[PDB]
Amino acid sequence: SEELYYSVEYKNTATFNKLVKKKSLNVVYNIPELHVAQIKMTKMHANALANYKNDIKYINATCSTCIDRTSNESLFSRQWDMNKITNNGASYDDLPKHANTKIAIIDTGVMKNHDDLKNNFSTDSKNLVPLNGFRGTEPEETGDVHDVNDRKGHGTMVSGQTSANGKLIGVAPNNKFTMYRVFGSKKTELLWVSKAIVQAANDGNQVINISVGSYIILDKNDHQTFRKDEKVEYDALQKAINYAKKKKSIVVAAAGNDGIDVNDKQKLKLQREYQGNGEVKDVPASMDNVVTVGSTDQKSNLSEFSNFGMNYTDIAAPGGSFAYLNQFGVDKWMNEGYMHKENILTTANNGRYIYQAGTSLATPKVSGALALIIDKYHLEKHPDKAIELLYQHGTSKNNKPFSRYGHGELDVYKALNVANQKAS
Ligand code: NA
Numbered sequence: 056s057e058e059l060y061y062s063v064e065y066k067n068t069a070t071f072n073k074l075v076k077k078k079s080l081n082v083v084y085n086i087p088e089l090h091v092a093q094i095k096m097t098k099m100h101a102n103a104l105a106n107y108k109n110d111i112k113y114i115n116a117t118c119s120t121c122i123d124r125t126s127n128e129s130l131f132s133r134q135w136d137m138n139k140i141t142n143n144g145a146s147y148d149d150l151p152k153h154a155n156t157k158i159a160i161i162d163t164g165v166m167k168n169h170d171d172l173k174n175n176f177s178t179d180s181k182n183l184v185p186l187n188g189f190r191g192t193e194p195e196e197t198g199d200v201h202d203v204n205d206r207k208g209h210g211t212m213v214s215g216q217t218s219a220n221g222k223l224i225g226v227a228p229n230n231k232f233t234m235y236r237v238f239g240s241k242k243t244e245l246l247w248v249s250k251a252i253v254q255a256a257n258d259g260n261q262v263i264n265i266s267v268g269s270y271i272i273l274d275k276n277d278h279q280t281f282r283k284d285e286k287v288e289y290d291a292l293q294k295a296i297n298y299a300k301k302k303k304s305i306v307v308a309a310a311g312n313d314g315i316d317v318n319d320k321q322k323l324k325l326q327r328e329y330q331g332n333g334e335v336k337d338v339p340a341s342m343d344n345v346v347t348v349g350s351t352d353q354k355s356n357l358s359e360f361s362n363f364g365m366n367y368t369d370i371a372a373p374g375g376s377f378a379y380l381n382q383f384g385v386d387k388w389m390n391e392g393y394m395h396k397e398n399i400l401t402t403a404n405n406g407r408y409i410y411q412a413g414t415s416l417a418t419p420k421v422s423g424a425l426a427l428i429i430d431k432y433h434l435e436k437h438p439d440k441a442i443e444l445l446y447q448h449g450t451s452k453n454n455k456p457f458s459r460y461g462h463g464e465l466d467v468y469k470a471l472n473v474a475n476q477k478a479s
Contacts, residue, residue, distance in 0.1 A: 060190055061101050062246065062287035064113040065090050074110050084185055086250045088298060091291040093117060093246055105281040113290070115282040120327070121243055121269040122147045122220065122228050130222045130408065135353055136373035136399050137224060140420060142468035147228070149471040151430040154229035158217050158426050159260030159304075160419070161251045161267065162210035163238040164203045166404045171221030172214055172232075179258055180234040183251045188239035196239045203236040208404035210234060212411055213266050215402030216419035217426075223402055226423030226467060230430075233260055237267070245269060245288040245338075252295035256302040261429060261438055263299055264422040265308045265345075266415035270326040271338050283331075293342050300344050305438050307346045307422045308339045309414040311362035316458075317341060318364045341367055346425070346442060349461065350374025350417040353397055355451070357459045361414055368461040370450060372420035375399045375412025424449060424467050431471055448473045 060083070065071040068087050075082055078100070084093035090112070096104070105114050124131040124144040131137065131144060138144060157177065167176045178201075186198030205211045220228035235251040237243045248267060255263045274284040296306050315322045323335040340347045340362070349371040350358040357363060358376050379393035388394050399416045403409035428434065428441045428449065449470030450463035 056097065058095055058097055059101070060117040061094050061096060062115055062117045062291075063092050063094055063104070063111060064287045064290055065092065066110055066112055070110045074107060078104070080104070084244070084246055084250070086246065086253060086291065088253050089249060089291050089294045091246060091249070091287060093244070102281060108280070111280060113280055113282060113287050115285060115287050117244065117246070117288070118285055119242065120245060120271045120285055120288065121267065122224060124224065128222055130400065131224050133395065134223065134400050135396070136375070137226070139355070139373055140226070140465050140467045146468035146471050147224070149468070150229060151427065154227065154426070154430055156230055156262060156426040156429045156435075157258070157260040158227065158230055158232045158422055159235060159255035159258070159263045160210065160213055160217065160232055161235045161237055161248060161255065161263065161265050162213050163207040164205035164210045164236040165214045165234040166205055166211045166406065167203065169211065169402050169406050171219040171223050171402050172211075175218040175220060175228075175231050177231045177233040181254055182236045183247045183254065184236055184239045185247070189241040189244065193239045193241055203234045205404050206240045207238055209266070209415065210236070211404040212401045212409065213264065213415055213419050216416055217264065217423040219402055223400065223408065226420050227426045230423070230426045233258060243267065245271070245292055249291040249295035252299055252306065256299040256304045261304050261435065262422045262425045263304050263306045264419055265306060265339060266418050268309055268311045268340055269338055270323065270335050272327055272329055272331070272333070272335055274331065274333060276332070289338065292339055296339060296342055296344050303436070303438050305346060305425055305442060306339070306344065307348060307418055307425065309418040310340050310347055310349045310368060311337045312360045312413050313362060314360050315362050316364045317362055317367045337362060346370065346421060347461070348372055348414065348418040348421045349459065350414040351460075351464050352376035352378065355454060355464050358412070358414075360412075363459045365458040368459060370421055370446065370461045370465060371454065371463065372417035372465040373399065374414050374417030377412060420465055421445070424465055424470055427467065428470055432473075444473065445470060
């Protein structure tokens with residue numbers, strides 16, 4: 056009588072709804088635009104449902120795969136990472152006069168009342184966490200659409216990198232950001248992330264920042280309706296990304312934080328302790344139509360924790376390092392200044408600040424930059440032109456190889472001054 060969570064890919068809204076009523080299916084999540092739903096049912100009903108060939112494409116069990124720069128109040132001079140990409144703050148004098156692009160952030164939520172974020176916070180922000188949250192195990196989650204308060208703290212850190220405009224300064228200090236909450240206090244579902252991408256794209260956010268990664272199992276050798284891999288989620292996520300592209304939104308994704316060359320299939324399978332036959336992928340970072348951002352340290356070298364590889368990394372931005380911590384131990388690291396040199400200062404969920412590191416802190420820098428580029432050159436109708444400008448004129452050309460840095464480390468000063476070429 057065991058009832059489990061199944062991910063289902065269906066063929067048609069009208070026939071699916073009709074089938075739901077006929078078999079009284081308990082649909083606990085649904086994304087009409089992608090033809091995917093999550094249904095809670097017995098293994099016996101899951102198997103019978105897989106036999107409705109006119110309506111059901113795939114079914115699999117859902118799994119656990121996842122501007123003041125100089126006043127005495129300014130912390131801008133401590134933001135080494137922000138200084139590095141802006142020519143020490145000079146790029147803030149070249150910002151577009153009107154900052155109309157909306158940056159969507161899909162993450163844990165945000166402290167909307169943080170002093171550095173409140174002016175840029177958009178009330179169009181939405182909660183995608185359903186009533187009762189992860190697998191119905193968090194009754195405090197009411198499914199309230201406007202509740203985007205951050206419980207974990209990560210989303211607040213990310214938002215600061217794109218939009219802080221107070222003591223701390225983000226990459227795009229005059230642009231509004233929209234938070235799409237996909238975490239309660241527990242885990243997230245890739246289906247919630249997919250719905251958040253669709254929502255962001257429908258809300259007109261032309262830049263969508265995804266700091267969440269996950270290693271997903273998919274098996275292209277199996278074509279059965281009822282599957283053992285995570286096919287439905289994979290499809291939902293790639294379809295969400297392509298949906299965003301059709302709506303003229305760019306999706307920016309963080310590379311993973313496991314320091315692995317994603318071309319080494321063996322090392323990837325090891326992330327899910329998987330022995331099938333059988334492939335593991337880092338998603339959405341390795342998916343089609345995503346800008347994949349790797350992380351660099353304070354010396355512009357690739358962070359030791361950053362994933363990388365050919366046909367993966369598109370660009371890199373400062374995300375920090377723990378080299379000093381590993382070399383000198385905790386005591387010397389926090390008390391002799393090293394933490395401050397190799398970690399990223401960002402906005403914290405306590406209304407103050409915190410030092411962190413990771414690709415999730417590099418990615419918002421790139422998202423912010425794309426928002427600036429779209430507004431500066433008026434590329435709203437052709438957002439791919441923003442990506443090409445970023446790649447060809449918005450990075451440093453001192454970083455190599457491509458398999459590690461992609462087109463290079465982000466340089467916002469260069470990206471904003473393409474019309475102001477200087478003869479050398
Ligand atoms: Na301008």
